[PDB]
Amino acid sequence: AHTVKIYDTCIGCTQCVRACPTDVLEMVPWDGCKAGQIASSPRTEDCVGCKRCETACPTDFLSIRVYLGAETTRSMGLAY
Amino acid sequence: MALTDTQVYIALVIALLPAVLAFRLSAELYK
Amino acid sequence: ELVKPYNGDPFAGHLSTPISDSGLVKTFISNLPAYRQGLSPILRGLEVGMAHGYFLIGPWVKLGPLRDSDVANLGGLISGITLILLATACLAAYGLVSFQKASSSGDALKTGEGWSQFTAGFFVGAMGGAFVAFFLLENFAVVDGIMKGLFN
Amino acid sequence: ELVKPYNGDPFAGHLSTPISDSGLVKTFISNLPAYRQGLSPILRGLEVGMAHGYFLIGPWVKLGPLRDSDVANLGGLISGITLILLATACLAAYGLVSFQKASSSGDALKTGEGWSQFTAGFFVGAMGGAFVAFFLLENFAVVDGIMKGLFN
Amino acid sequence: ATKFPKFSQDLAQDPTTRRIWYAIATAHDFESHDGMTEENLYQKIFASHFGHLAIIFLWVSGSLFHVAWQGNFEQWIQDPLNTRPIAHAIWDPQFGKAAVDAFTQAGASSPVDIAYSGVYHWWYTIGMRTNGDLYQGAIFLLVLASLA
Amino acid sequence: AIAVLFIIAGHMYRTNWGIGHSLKEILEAHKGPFTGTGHKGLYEVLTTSWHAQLAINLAMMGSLSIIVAQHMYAMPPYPYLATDYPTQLSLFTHHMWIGGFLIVGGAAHGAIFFVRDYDPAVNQNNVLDRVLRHRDAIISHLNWVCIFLGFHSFGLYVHNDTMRAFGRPQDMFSDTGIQLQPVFAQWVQHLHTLAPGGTAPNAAATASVAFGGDVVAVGGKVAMMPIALGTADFLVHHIHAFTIHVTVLILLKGVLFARSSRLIPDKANLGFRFPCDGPGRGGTCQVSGWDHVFLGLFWMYNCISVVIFHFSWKMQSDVWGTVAPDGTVSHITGGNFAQSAITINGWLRDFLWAQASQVIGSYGSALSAYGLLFLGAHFVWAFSLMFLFSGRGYWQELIESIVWAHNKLKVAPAIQPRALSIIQGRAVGVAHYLLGGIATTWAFFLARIISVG
Amino acid sequence: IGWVTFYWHWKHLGVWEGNVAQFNENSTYLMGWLRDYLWLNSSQLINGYNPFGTNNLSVWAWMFLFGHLVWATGFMFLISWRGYWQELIETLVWAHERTPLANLVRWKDKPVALSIVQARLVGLAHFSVGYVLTYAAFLIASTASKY
Amino acid sequence: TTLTGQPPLYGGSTGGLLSKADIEEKYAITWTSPKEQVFEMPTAGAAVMREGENLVYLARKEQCLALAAQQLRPRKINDYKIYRIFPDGETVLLHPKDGVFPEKVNQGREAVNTVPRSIGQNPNPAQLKFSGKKPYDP
Amino acid sequence: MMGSYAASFLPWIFIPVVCWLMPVVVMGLLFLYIEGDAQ
Amino acid sequence: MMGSYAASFLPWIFIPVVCWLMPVVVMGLLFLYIEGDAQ
Ligand code: CLA
Ligand code: CLA
Ligand code: CLA
Ligand code: CLA
Ligand code: CLA
Ligand SMILES: CC1=C(/C=C/C(C)=C/C=C/C(C)=C/C=C/C=C(C)/C=C/C=C(C)/C=C/C2=C(C)CCCC2(C)C)C(C)(C)CCC1
Ligand SMILES: CC1=C(C/C=C(\C)CCC[C@H](C)CCC[C@H](C)CCCC(C)C)C(=O)c2ccccc2C1=O
Ligand SMILES: CC1=C(C/C=C(\C)CCC[C@H](C)CCC[C@H](C)CCCC(C)C)C(=O)c2ccccc2C1=O
Ligand code: SF4
Ligand code: SF4
Ligand code: SF4
Ligand SMILES: [Ca+2]
Ligand SMILES: [Ca+2]
């Protein structure tokens, strides 16, 4: 399965969560920024590796990082 | 002189030893 | 360490030797068709028969009484065919006398039905192997020209 | 109504069409020896192999490198036998790799034992079909005289 | 999962065809393998180095053996400017008669390849004169590869 | 007669006086037991989407340009065109290239329609809905027919190359080996020469001399003569069918899968022109309809290049040439097509190597510009592969260092230098590839047929 | 390396033939490289087999064409990229799973397109093999038909 | 579980479920529409969404979320639930797992795979030689 | 295609071995190895 | 038994088809259908 890590430069704009096509990320409470929320990736088993979440991230550098790894049925996006 | 049949057979039989030696090396490198 | 008790059992009448218990010999023997796991008995028999019937006719073809004639391949074939007939009679008689007792739910070659399937497979494969060896030996001029490309 | 969901399931990845679902096509496919109910796998392989081996040597007989020679049927048969040997090897290797998992109480052809029976039946049927095709081709003068009444 | 590849469980659990392909391209990247320590890394590189040395030795042995067996080394000594060095014989059953006649070259009777390695000139400059010298070179490299 | 039938045909549609048809009524009328509601909704589709009209009109204009190319050579409609071999070759080749481009563009705007202007509410169980609902069957069967055509045409060619190199000419697919005679084309050729007194009684001559007749000899040269079709023409016709089928496969895969796929279920939200959806799902580069147009451009290039190569060699070998005063035809390449156009080596030797002698010996003469454009078009085609084989990540990382060197000398521009986008890199590569290859063939063709024809 | 070996071979063809003026006159423009080196010296390699027979250069003609084929097959992997081929393979998987008599046979590994790095490598390897085999065939046959 | 709902009026497509559904896993999306309307299936084509509760079986989670994102959400249907269904028949609720959409911050959620540093404050590959340590390790 | 070299019957058998038999055996054994669904 | 009429090989195949193959097929299919012991 792919690995999705959220770094503490996350400003809680929720844009990575909205861009995820497979519902990997969610917004959880976190007192580390003004928005009061951080991205989380509890469902990286459903991560396909598309990196739409990194594309949506406005921080420099990325507060969300996808590391592509071992490939499963789910991560390779197979309908068969 | 041109090679004889026995020299070709001897070359085959002698090269049969690096066969098992390469097989043993590949088996030990697989482990 | 090289020679040890067979399967770790000191009192079994065997020694675990690199002829008898090494990995290469074990996988080669266990993947012979009589031991290859998952096979139906008839396919085990077919492969065993092919391998045996292919080489049986050869001794008579090159060394039999018809070897110095026009019909050496035919004599070797007739000899191999009837020797396979005796071999199959031996196999079916062994199956008839050896499994009139109860049946094991494990290996199929230790039951009467599985041994009869093995016997049928052996007969078919051995007659096929004997005939294909005869056919190649008789048409050896054609095979020879094919491998040299004389027909091109 | 000709084209509808396959088995009434709108989400299945298929379309029930008069090619994929019509009764003539359905019963013809179901009555092929692969799908025919009550056939043990050995007879399925026998019929399938007979059909495949019978037509397999034809391309080499009329098109191969020996087509312009005296031994055209011979070369076609040799090539067909070798191709059928590789085909039987492919079937048996598929059965070895595919059914090393546990067994189903459903189809026998999704079982290692059943696929091995199918493989053996395929081998015997295909070698037999190739050989009878070669035999009729090699004796086409005799067959032709039989139908022409040249022996009456 | 599968057995193949033994060195990578990430590829071993891959249910696609990629499991084969990537394994072939990650078989010699020992540092990325499972359970690899530095000691086993250096020892495996050592053993692979010897296996490569033996492959090199068998390759030179093959060139020498084919020149001694199917080549024209001695006839090439007697006329090095106008004889063509023969690499090995040709056995292609799909040849027609015209290709058999065309590749029948360099004074040979059967189809042969004309050697362009320059091995004949190198062996002629370093003292080899008969097919026996080439044959002894072949067997000596055949046991040197065994030693490797 | 064209005028009369076209003024007639401009009276079928109802406009202002209650006579004619509404085309909606025609379309919604036409439906069948296989195709649901049939053509209901296609009137709204074709009256609201400019792209749905551009697709059809580009496809028909490309097909008609191809028709024009294949019609103006065998019946040259202008005086002394048939004996103007440069003009014949150039006009055929030009209209084929324009036709292939416009056909690819029709496929492009079909995909654009599907991603942008497809409304499923209009297209409920009509022909459009149902082709979307079995696109997998369509594309898989087109895939199979493409593989079949590729093997049984090009594999025949390399079988012939191998048999010829073996010294086995009797084992070749040739007129002297294993014959593949194009019997259907031959009989249709027969039917057109038995028609100027038969099935077209009120007519003096046939439609064209290509179907049969005798060598029209205007000036010293052949105007047109019967074009015999044999094993070689069978082979190259099936090569054309294969290349057309693969171009259709790519473009129809782009059009039918522009909205969604099993891999990407939301391609409509991504759009027509997007590079990928990331390295995930194994890697999703070139899933867009734009990228299928990008690949179909190369395959159109392959198809049209083989078509014009077939035309050039067949005309120079079996049609064009010099008629002697006694009345024998000395063809330009002397009929090498029937025995050399059956191997790839024959195409490389007797067409590409042999006929490019004029384009490379052109230096110092009036055709030297054609040799210069031959070399320059080789250059542009090879320049394309830098854009085609690379990606923009490398170029951005390199532009970073050149930006550093500009930043040291206080000359880094305010408009930030960036590598071209992924789609733009593909577009530049395919544009330079098409330009380079097409201009290479153009310079070759014109130099050959002007120096010799 | 192609530039290196093209230069070496053309200069040495001029030197071995004694016609050094061929190189020393036509290597200054690039039409000389295409005409007087590539077009000329292919002439006997190309006629390795023809409609009239076969020479001993027939294997080099076949390998010349073979190398052109491998080199162009690499262009497929280098130009077309993955998601096209994955979408094609999904339709092929559908076609296999819905075809009678082939439903009995199932893949053990799910068919997928080549990875992005993988097909970069495969296209590069085809490009390299075609490059090397084409130039080797040209070099040996153009230097073996004369001396 | 026991996922209820009328299937939408769909003529079926070749792009639907395959053997992975019956052997490995499939997915379902359930929702409620107020009306018979038209939407586009991810397996291509137009479908008629029924009054009340609709249930759709799809092959991937991404197809269920694509239908939810491009069809249900613009039509103001935000009650959809996505399930994974195993070949035996066991059913796991997936997408609105806590009942709150993941784009909305919800108490009780714990941060998973968060890193308490910036990205290039990750260690070097060289220092993280033979061990289980990855440079993105917490 | 029958050379004057010593033991000329050896390509006759060895070319089908190295070209057909050995690739068939190696391909089959590697097929049985890479598709073993073991632990 | 060989006529001057066109395609004279056609009786050679068709008489065994009409007299052996088609009858065996028809009786086998009808035997399966009339002995079909379903409802
Ligand atoms: C002594 C020389 C040497 C050694 C020991 C290595 C060792 C290594 N290299 Mg390296 N390399 C070398 C030279 C060397 N290389 C050269 C000369 C090049 C330029 C081409 C490269 C470029 C290179 C790259 C880019 C990479 C490596 C990588 C690696 C590591 C893993 C290799 C691997 O598993 O994949 C094995 C490779 C294969 C299985 C591919 C086989 C290629 C075949 C033989 C090509 C032949 C084509 C075809 C079959 C020919 C047929 C012709 C016929 C049809 C006529 C390994 C430690 C990889 C790595 O791990 O990076 C971290 C890596 O990415 N190498
Ligand atoms: C259909 C086309 C065709 C085919 C099939 C062949 C086949 C062959 N030719 Mg050939 N040839 C051809 C066309 C063809 N030719 C033409 C048109 C000509 C011009 C007339 C020639 C001229 C010619 C000459 C001059 C020679 C041949 C020779 C040969 C034989 C090579 C023996 C060998 O070692 O194989 C084995 C193949 C290899 C070692 C290379 C394959 C390596 C692959 C690409 C990569 C493998 C690496 C990978 C890790 C391993 C995969 C697993 C594997 C173990 C299963 C072989 C039988 C030679 C011969 O006669 O043998 C002595 C010979 O020198 N041919
Ligand atoms: C010369 C280079 C080359 C070759 C050989 C191919 C070949 C192919 N392309 Mg392709 N392509 C190329 C360049 C090439 N392309 C380039 C440069 C691009 C960039 C835009 C593309 C983009 C492209 C797309 C977008 C598509 C293709 C498709 C195809 C396949 C067409 C189906 C077919 O013909 O079946 C048969 C295959 C051949 C005729 C190839 C020659 C093989 C010979 C005749 C047989 C070999 C003999 C035997 C197998 C040898 C066995 C040896 C053994 C030891 C391994 C085919 C395999 C289409 C496809 O997938 O179709 C279904 C597809 O949609 N191509
Ligand atoms: C390693 C170098 C090498 C090479 C490239 C060749 C190549 C060739 N040999 Mg030769 N051979 C070699 C070494 C070599 N040989 C040695 C050292 C001997 C003495 C035992 C022989 C004995 C021999 C005979 C009797 C014959 C050939 C023949 C042939 C030709 C046909 C292919 C074949 O059947 O091989 C057959 C190979 C053997 C019989 C012995 C193989 C032993 C070598 C050392 C194995 C090398 C394996 C290699 C290192 C593994 C790397 C694989 C790679 C993919 C990673 C072919 C040109 C045939 C011929 O002459 O065609 C006309 C022929 O009949 N060879
Ligand atoms: C219905 C009238 C009719 C009758 C009584 C016959 C009778 C005969 N035909 Mg025939 N035939 C017919 C129509 C008929 N034909 C038509 C319309 C064609 C054109 C396709 C042919 C083409 C044809 C060929 C090529 C040959 C014959 C031959 C023969 C002779 C051998 C039997 C056979 O193989 O037939 C073959 C049957 C066909 C090829 C197809 C027949 C097509 C008809 C329409 C089917 C009739 C079905 C019938 C009406 C259903 C009623 C069945 C009843 C029990 C309820 C036989 C005397 C053979 C011959 O000449 O022997 C010397 C020969 O080879 N026929
Ligand atoms: C490897 C090895 C070895 C060796 C082994 C051997 C000894 C071998 C062999 C072998 C053999 C011994 C083989 C065989 C075979 C066979 C076959 C391949 C067969 C066949 C057959 C057929 C093909 C048949 C057919 C048929 C039928 C069934 C019916 C009809 C008729 C006919 C005839 C068609 C050694 C010692 C080193 C060690 C161990 C391992
Ligand atoms: C070379 C290359 C580049 C670099 C190409 C660039 C940056 C194009 C820009 C080049 C021209 C020369 C820029 C011209 C700049 C000004 C317009 C110059 C002023 C012109 C006056 C002289 C009139 C990519 O960005 C790229 C991206 C994706 C895939 C492949 C490639 C690729 O191959
Ligand atoms: C054609 C093509 C495919 C399709 C190609 C596939 C699926 C490979 C299929 C190859 C078949 C299995 C035959 C391979 C034959 C080889 C010559 C065998 C060698 C294998 C060694 C291990 C021996 C891609 O998947 C792809 C992915 C990314 C960018 C470009 C492309 C691309 O261009
Ligand atoms: S897009 Fe980036 S900044 Fe916004 S919530 Fe996601 S990780 Fe944080
Ligand atoms: S890589 Fe794709 S699937 Fe994975 S978390 Fe990012 S957007 Fe979601
Ligand atoms: S290589 Fe380029 S096109 Fe392919 S997935 Fe990566 S960014 Fe997208
Ligand atoms: Ca005697
Ligand atoms: Ca022949």
Question: What is the Cα–Cα distance from A23 to A7, expressed in whole angstroms?
Answer: 19
- Which ligand 1 atom is at minimum distance from the Cα of E32? 60
Peptide bond into A61 cis (omega under 30): yes
CB atoms within 10 A of CB F20: 12
**Beta bridge partners of residue D4, listed in sequence order:** D16
Task: Name residues whose C-beta falls within 8 Å of residue F221's C-beta, 6 or more positions apart in sequence.
Answer: F83, F85, F320, F321, F322, F323
Residue G105: alpha-carbon gap to chain centroid: 36
Cα separations (Å) of E109 from A63, E102, F126, I14? Answer: 75, 11, 74, 20
DSSP letters of D79-101? Answer: HHHHHHHHHHHHHHHHHHHHT-S
Ligand 4 atom nearest to CA at E58: 1
| F165 CB near ligand 2 (under 6 Å) | yes
Separation in Å, CA I5 to CA E89, I10, I11: 9, 10, 11
Residues 6+ apart with CB under 8 A from F46: F52, F53, F56
Q: Where are the alpha helices (DSSP H) in F257-322?
A: 267-270, 289-318
Residues 6+ apart with CB under 8 A from C41: C108, C109, C114, C115, C117, C118, C121
CB distance from C23 to chain E under 8 Å?
A: no
Element of type H or E holding D28 = helix D23-30
F/H interface, count of CB pairs below 8 Å: 67
Could you give the CA distance from residue A61 to residue A7 in angstroms, rounded to a whole number? Answer: 10
Write the single-letter amino acid at H79: D
Rg (CA), chain H: 20
Four-residue CA torsion sign, J10, J11, J12, J15: positive
> Please, which residues bridge with residue H39 across strands?
H47
Q: What is the DSSP string of I1-39?
A: ---SSSSTTHHHHHHHIIIIIHHHHHHHHHHHHHT----
Rounded to a whole number, what is the distance in Å from the CA of G100 to chain E's nearest CA?
A: 23
CB F216 within 8 A of CB F224: yes
Q: State how far the Cα of F386 lies from the Cα of F389, in Å rounded to an integer.
A: 6
Q: Judging by DSSP bridges, how do beta strands H81-85 and H91-93 pair with one another?
A: antiparallel
- DSSP letter at H111 equals P
Measured from the CA of E21, which atom of ligand 8 is nearest?
A: 22
Interface contact E20, partner G, CB < 8 A: yes
Which of I 1-39 lie inside 8 A of D, CB atoms? 24, 28, 31-32, 35-37
Atom of ligand 11 nearest to the CA of F391: 2
Ligand 8: residue whose CA is nearest its atom 32: G77
Extract the tokens encoding D39.
């056939």
CB atoms within 10 A of CB A21: 26
Using CB atoms, pick whichever of F34, F136, F171 lies closest to residue D3: F34
Say if F and G touch: at least 3 Cβ pairs within 8 Å: yes
Cβ distance of D94 and G105 shorter than 8 Å: yes
Tokens of F116: 């942008």
CB-based contacts of A66, cutoff 8 Å, min separation 6: A2, A3, A4, A47, A49, A51, A53, A54, F280
Contacts with F178 from chain D: Cβ below 8 Å: 63
Resolution, rounded to a tenth of an Å?
2.3
| I4 contacts E4? CB cut-off 8 A | no
Task: Using alpha carbons, select from F141, H23, H41 the residue that is nearest to residue D20.
Answer: F141
Partners of chain J (3+ Cβ pairs below 8 A): D
Q: Which of E20, E70, E91 sits opposite I15 (nearest CB)?
A: E91
Least CB–CB distance from C43: residue in D69, D120, D127: D120
Of the bound ligands, which one is closest to the alpha carbon of residue D75?
Answer: 13
G40 C-alpha vs ligand 3 centroid, how far in Å?
31
To the question of whether residue C9 is assigned a binding role by annotation, the answer is no
SS3 state at F382: helix
Q: List chain H residues with CB under 8 Å of E38.
A: 129-130
Buried/exposed A61-70: b ≥16 CB within 10 Å, e otherwise: ebbbbbebee
Query: Is the C-beta atom of F430 inside 6 A of ligand 7?
Result: no
**Which of F117, F130, F144, F150 is closest to F50 using CA atoms?**
F117
**Chain A residues close to H107, C-beta within 8 Å:** 29
Task: Give me ligand 8 centre to Cα D100, in Å.
Answer: 28
Query: Which site among D98, D101, D111 would you substitute to test the G interface, given the most G Cβ atoms closer than 10 Å to its Cβ?
Result: D98
Is residue I33 less than 8 Å (CB to CB) from chain G? no
Both tokens of H117, joined, read: 């540093």
Please indicate whether, in this complex, the C-beta atoms of E91 and I4 are within 8 angstroms of each other. no
Query: Considering only CB atoms, which chain F residues are within 8 Å of H42?
Result: 260, 265-266
The DSSP element (H or E) to which F442 belongs, if any, is helix F422-451
Q: Is D138 annotated as a binding residue?
A: no
DSSP F395-423: HHHHHHHHHHHHHHTT---SS---PPPHH
Residue of G nearest to H13 (CA): G94
CA atoms of F88 and F316, how far apart (whole Å): 11
Interface check for A37 against chain H (CB to CB < 8 A): the answer is yes
B27 contacts chain I (CB < 8 A): no
Q: Indicate whether residue G77 lines ligand 8 (CB < 6 A).
A: yes
Terminal CA-to-CA distance of chain D, rounded, Å? 60
Residue B30: CB atoms within 10 Å: 8
Name, in order, each residue with C-beta under 8 angstroms of E124's C-beta and a sequence gap of 6 or more: E76, E77, E80
Q: Which residue has the tokens 């439906």?
A: F31
Could you write out the DSSP letters of every residue in F2-40? HHHHHHHHTTSB--SSS-SB-HHHHHHH---SSSTTBTT
Helix (H, G, I), strand (E, B) or coil at F223: strand
Identify which of H99, H30, H36 has the alpha carbon closest to the alpha carbon of residue H68. H30
Does B11 contact E at CB distance below 8 Å?
yes
Per the entry, the structure determination technique was: cryo-EM
- State residue B3 phi and psi, 5-degree precision: -65, 150
Residues with Cβ within 5 Å of ion ligand 13? C 151; D 65, 68
List the single residue in D86, D96, D101 with the smallest CB-CB distance to I32: D96
3-state secondary structure chain C: CCCEEECCECCCCCEECCCCCCHHHHHHHHCCCCCCCCCCHHHHHHHHHHHHHHHHCHHHHHHCCCCCCCCHHHHHHHHHHHHHHHHHHHHHHHHHHHCCCCCCCCCHHHCHHHHHHHHHHHHHHHHHHHHHHHHHHHCHHHHHHHHHCCCC
Helix (H, G, I), strand (E, B) or coil at F443: helix
Cis peptide preceding E5, ω within 30 of 0: yes
- Nearest residue to G67 (alpha-carbon basis) of G128, G4, G143, G1: G128
Of F350, F343, F344, the C-alpha closest to F171 is: F343
| Pairing verdict, β H114-115 and A3-7 | parallel
Give the closest residue (by CA) to ligand 2 atom 23. G59
A33 is in an annotated binding site: no
With b for 16 or more beta-carbon neighbours within 10 A and e for fewer, the D93-115 pattern comes to bbbbbbbbeeeeeeebbebbbbb
Ligand nearest to the CA of J5: 5
G76 Cβ closer than 6 Å to some ligand 8 atom: yes
Q: Which of F82, F400, F416 is nearest to F221 (CA)?
A: F82
- Does any ligand 6 atom lie closer than 6 A to the CB of residue D124? yes
Query: Is G88 part of the contact surface with chain E (CB cutoff 8 Å)?
Result: no
- Residues sharing a CB contact under 8 Å with residue E146, sequence separation 6 or more, in sequence order: B17, B18, B21, E54
- Closest residue (by CA) to atom 4 of ligand 10? A47
Q: Are residues C33 and C39 in contact, defined by beta-carbon separation less than 8 angstroms? A: yes
DSSP string, A17-66: HHH-TT---EEEE-TTSTTSEEEE-TTGGG-----HHHHH--SSS-SEEE
Tokens 């070689």 found at: F232
- Residue A53 is labelled as binding a ligand: yes
Q: Which residue of I has its CA nearest to G109?
A: I35
Close Cβ partners of J23 (under 8 Å, ≥ 6 residues apart): none
Taking the CA of residue G79 as reference, the ligand 3 atom at the shortest distance is 19
By 3-state DSSP, what share of chain F in percent is helix, strand and coil, each rounded to 5?
A: 60, 5, 35
CA E32 – ligand 10 centroid, Å: 25
Smallest CA–CA distance, residue A69 to chain G, in Å, is: 13
Q: Is C143 on the interface with E (CB under 8 A)?
A: no
The number of C-alpha atoms within 13 Å of F262 and in the hemisphere containing its C-beta is 31
